[PDB]
Write a protein that binds this ligand. Structure first.
Ligand code: CLA
Ligand code: CLA
Ligand SMILES: CCCCCCCCCCCCCCCCCC(=O)OC[C@H](CO[C@@H]1O[C@H](CO)[C@H](O)[C@H](O)[C@H]1O)OC(=O)CCCCCCCCCCCCCCCCC
Ligand code: HEC
Ligand SMILES: CC1=C(/C=C/C(C)=C/C=C/C(C)=C/C=C/C=C(C)/C=C/C=C(C)/C=C/C2=C(C)CCCC2(C)C)C(C)(C)CCC1
Ligand SMILES: CCCCCCCS[C@@H]1O[C@H](CO)[C@@H](O)[C@H](O)[C@H]1O
Ligand SMILES: CCCCCCCS[C@@H]1O[C@H](CO)[C@@H](O)[C@H](O)[C@H]1O
Ligand SMILES: CCCCCCCS[C@@H]1O[C@H](CO)[C@@H](O)[C@H](O)[C@H]1O
Ligand SMILES: CCCCCCCS[C@@H]1O[C@H](CO)[C@@H](O)[C@H](O)[C@H]1O
Ligand SMILES: CCCCCCCS[C@@H]1O[C@H](CO)[C@@H](O)[C@H](O)[C@H]1O
Ligand SMILES: [Ca+2]
Ligand SMILES: [Ca+2]
Lengths: 56, 137, 244, 56, 56, 97
């Protein structure tokens, strides 16, 4: 039932900070742009856009 | 209930002789035991070796027997392991090692009798509390 | 040139085995009439591998890398025992005592933590026959015991244990017991492990040897509550051999 | 102490148990008074006591 | 009351199995702590049957 | 069936006497003359196929043998139980007062 995971994978986000990858590899380092980093970036963007909306 | 002469009557030796301590001896024994012994033996246990306690039944099965005045007085001069096999004055307070356990330096023969009498009378008062540890507090 | 505790403390060197120079490619003669012992055996693990638990039996499971989370607390050291010369010229090390176990927790991809009792308890390890001298071609292979990771007093978070503790789930006073038996009845594991020691360097003059090891053993089974994993440990070792 | 348990009346009338696990199991229920068989499946009962309408 | 009835049965010559078998199940059921209203919990919701089960 | 092996052992002679193969060393304080000198030798030289084998401990003095002979009635032997002998528990089993 995964809906956004395939969209992250489509454009190159395949790994977790916890060490797994969707291709089944172990001990990979995805850097910051893991599934979690993508999620975090979108949450922060949301907050910044919210604050900008208040200003405008 | 009162601290009667009967309570204060304890075995002097292994051969059936008793000695009746005075109330002043009992009070002296409590004071001297706190002074020299309770840091390890509070309440009749042994903090640095809890397997061995000061219960009269335990003392009776020590070698040589320690459940009487003479046995306890000898222990405070020349302590041994529970089987009597090793002399432990080098790690247990005694008159023999008063050089390295300085609180023994001023204990007199009269003082040792009082300490021994305390160890024998106190379980007659406190029962299982004596040597019982925290379970019986 | 000899380091003190204050030189070492906090550096991580205390968890490392001694090393030998690259010049240590010698041979240590064995006198079949002399008795020997290992005065110090040290095992420093560098990699912990855990065999994955696959859903497909046709699929051959592999050992995968893991992350150590219990820090520089992993090495076995100060181990000693008899080094027997056997009639066929092989040598047998019989472990006697030492710091011969370490609890270790490693973490698999995805977060699963694997505790194990990394150990060579009761190690008995032997070389090939006719070892007239210990050289860089000498190997030791043997077995050891792996006791339960927790010993018998250990109490779980609901107070249950083997030699102590409750014997039921006291927070569920009227639950049916059958489904909880595996959690209620603690069991003490005792299994075997295997180890190989590959000698890579020998100081013929000092009787010191060093090399690599690989050992295999089961991980913690939580006193019977779940199945253990298979673990493979790789690292370096050091040993000092002395006439006894 | 070689503790055994025998039942009189009820389902278990006339039976005696001697294996320590079984004897212990009945002793645990005896702290609750008389011992009953319960259907815990129909309601997915969780084994934890609840009060009655008198309490509520 | 249970003990009184059992003793009266024994005194009239009943066996032990007969004396206890003469106790009404309803009477024995009152002598069980799971029916004590002081055994519940504020957020342990629902019928008593949800806890120890439906008595059989 | 799952069994607690310690509870099980309490139904054997282990629950009635000092088990020379299993019992923690503090139990030897129960009887005159056994602790600590003999108690250490007994635990060190365990296990024993029979109670009488304790008399074969190398180096025992003649007085030590007499003491053991007087106390054989208080000893038993059962199979070594891993759960009781691992962890150094025969020397310190986590119980004080
Ligand atoms: C700031 C930069 C940025 C970056 C690098 C990402 C990156 C990502 N986003 Mg996020 N996102 C962002 C900002 C960003 N986003 C913003 C501002 C919003 C709120 C609008 C979102 C809301 C959002 C959602 C709801 C989702 C993502 C998702 C994703 C992932 C998949 C992207 C994808 O498939 O797009 C596909 C993009 C297109 C197909 C673009 C279509 C463009 C149309 C056709 C243009 C037509 C008009 C144009 C002017 C015509 C003329 C063009 C001319 C050249 C001729 C990827 C990690 C997906 C995900 O995995 O979430 C976890 C997902 O579901 N993002
Ligand atoms: C006098 C009131 C009263 C009592 C004693 C009962 C008693 C019972 N009900 Mg009934 N019920 C009642 C009124 C009552 N009911 C009303 C008004 C309704 C309509 C909602 C119902 C609908 C109902 C249903 C649908 C069911 C019951 C059931 C039951 C049984 C289980 C009760 C239980 O689990 O409660 C649990 C009680 C609590 C968890 C306590 C809640 C405490 C609140 C949340 C505190 C709130 C604090 C407040 C916010 C703080 C504000 C402070 C502010 C000023 C600063 C029990 C016999 C159950 C049953 O077994 O049926 C056969 C069942 O299924 N009742
Ligand atoms: C608009 C209408 C208002 C709508 C409000 C919606 C309710 C929101 C708040 C809910 C509060 C109750 C939650 C209980 C949780 C629950 O699931 O219960 C669930 C329970 C039912 O319980 C269920 O029963 C089932 C079988 O029928 C199953 O056994 C379930 O396992 C069991 O949970 O609901 C009730 O019992 C309701 C009656 C409670 C009576 C309380 C009496 C005492 C209250 C006094 C409080 C005074 C406080 C004053 C403070 C000032
Ligand atoms: C700790 C530092 C102690 C102080 C102070 C005193 N004692 Fe002690 N006691 C201690 C130990 C560790 C032991 C066991 C020694 C062993 O290895 O056997 C003991 C034992 C005794 C005994 C024998 C108890 C028995 O059951 O046989 C006695 C009678 C005794 N100790 C008396 C005693 C007295 C009178 C003290 C003050 C003068 C005293 N002890 C100090 C530890 C310590
Ligand atoms: C480049 C880059 C990138 C991107 C980035 C981005 C996308 C950014 C954005 C950014 C943003 C998005 C920003 C924003 C900002 C905002 C702000 C700065 C705001 C402010 C506000 C204010 C100040 C307000 C205030 C107020 C309030 C709050 C209330 C009312 C009152 C008032 C109005 C006063 C990435 C990562 C990819 C990487 C590469 C590089
Ligand atoms: C606001 C949270 C910021 C956290 C930043 C963590 C950076 S972490 C860093 O990032 C690099 C770029 O992806 C990787 O190449 C590198 O391997 C990784 O360690
Ligand atoms: C808002 C604070 C959250 C910051 C979290 C930063 C994660 S940072 C991330 O961590 C991974 C290890 O877990 C590394 O594999 C990776 O290289 C690194 O960039
Ligand atoms: C001889 S050895 C001697 O042992 C004595 C106790 O017996 C101590 O008083 C003394 O300090 C210790 O050195
Ligand atoms: C924006 C920060 C989000 C917080 C990230 C939580 C850690 S990341 C998290 O770790 C779990 C345990 O290892 C894994 O099982 C899981 O797959 C992974 O997503
Ligand atoms: C032989 C041991 C298992 C049988 C005896 C255990 C107590 S009796 C047992 O207890 C459960 C909890 O009350 C009930 O759900 C069940 O109906 C009842 O048979
Ligand atoms: Ca080699
Ligand atoms: Ca259920």
């Amino acid at each position: 039932g995964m809906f956004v995971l395939p969209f992250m994978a489509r454009l190159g986000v395949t790994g977790s900070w916890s060490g797994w990858s969707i291709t089944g590899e172990t001990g990979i380092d995805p850097g910051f742009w893991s599934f979690e980093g993508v999620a975090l970036a979108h949450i922060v963007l949301s907050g910044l856009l919210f604050l900008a909306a208040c200003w405008h | 209930a009162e601290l009667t002469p009967e309570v204060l009557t304890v075995p002097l030796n292994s051969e059936g002789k008793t000695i009746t301590l005075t109330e002043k001896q009992y009070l002296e024994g409590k004071r001297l035991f706190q002074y020299a012994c309770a840091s390890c033996h509070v309440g009749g246990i042994t903090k640095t070796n809890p397997s061995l306690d000061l219960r009269t039944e335990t003392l009776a099965l020590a070698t040589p027997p320690r459940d009487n005045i003479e046995g306890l007085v000898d222990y405070m001069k020349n302590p041994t392991t529970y089987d009597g096999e090793q002399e432990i004055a080098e790690v247990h307070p005694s008159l023999r090692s008063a050089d390295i356990f300085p609180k023994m330096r001023n204990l007199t023969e009269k003082d040792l009798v009082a300490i021994a009498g305390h160890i024998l009378v106190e379980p007659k008062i406190l029962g299982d509390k004596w040597g019982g540890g925290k379970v019986y507090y | 040139q000899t380091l003190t505790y204050d030189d070492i403390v906090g550096t991580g060197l205390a968890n490392k085995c001694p090393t030998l120079d690259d010049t240590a490619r010698g041979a240590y003669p064995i006198d079949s009439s002399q008795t020997y012992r290992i005065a110090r055996l040290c095992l420093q693990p560098t990699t912990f591998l855990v065999k994955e638990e696959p859903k497909n039996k046709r699929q051959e499971a592999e050992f995968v890398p893991t992350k150590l989370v219990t820090r520089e607390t992993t090495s076995l050291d100060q181990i000693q025992g008899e080094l027997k010369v056997n009639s066929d010229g092989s040598l047998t090390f019989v472990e006697e005592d030492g710091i011969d176990f370490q609890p270790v927790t490693v973490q698999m991809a995805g977060g699963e933590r694997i505790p194990l009792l990394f150990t060579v308890k009761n190690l008995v390890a032997s070389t090939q026959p006719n070892v007239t001298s210990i050289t860089t071609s000498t190997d030791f292979k043997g077995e050891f015991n792996v006791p339960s990771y927790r010993t018998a007093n250990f109490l779980d978070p609901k107070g249950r244990g083997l030699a102590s503790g409750y014997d039921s789930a006291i927070a569920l006073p009227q639950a049916k017991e059958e489904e909880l038996a595996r959690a209620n009845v603690k069991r003490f594991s005792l299994t075997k492990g295997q180890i190989s020691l590959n000698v890579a360097k020998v100081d013929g003059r000092t009787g010191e040897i060093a090399g690599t090891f690989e050992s295999e053993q089961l991980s913690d089974d939580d006193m019977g509550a779940h199945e253990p994993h298979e673990v493979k440990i790789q690292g370096v070792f050091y040993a000092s051999i002395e006439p006894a | 102490q070689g503790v055994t348990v025998s039942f009189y009346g009820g389902e278990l009338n006339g039976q005696t148990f001697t294996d320590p696990p079984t004897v212990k199991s009945y002793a645990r229920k005896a702290i609750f008074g008389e011992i009953f068989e319960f259907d815990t499946e129909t309601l997915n009962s969780d084994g934890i006591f609840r009060t009655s309408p008198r309490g509520w | 009351e249970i003990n009184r009835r059992v003793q009266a049965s024994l005194a009239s010559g009943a066996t032990l199995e007969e004396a206890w078998s003469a106790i009404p199940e309803k009477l024995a059921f009152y002598d069980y702590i799971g029916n004590n209203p002081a055994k519940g919990g504020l957020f342990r919701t629902g019928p008593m049957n949800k806890g120890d089960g439906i008595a059989q | 069936e799952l069994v607690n092996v310690v509870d099980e052992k309490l139904g054997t002679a282990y629950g009635e006497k000092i088990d020379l193969n299993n019992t923690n060393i503090a139990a030897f304080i129960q009887y005159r003359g056994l602790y600590p000198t003999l108690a250490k030798l007994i635990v060190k030289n365990a296990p024993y196929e029979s109670v009488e084998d304790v008399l074969n401990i190398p180096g025992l003095t003649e007085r030590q043998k007499q003491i053991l002979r007087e106390n054989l009635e208080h000893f038993t032997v059962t199979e070594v139980e891993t759960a009781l002998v691992e962890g150094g528990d025969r020397y310190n089993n986590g119980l004080y007062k």
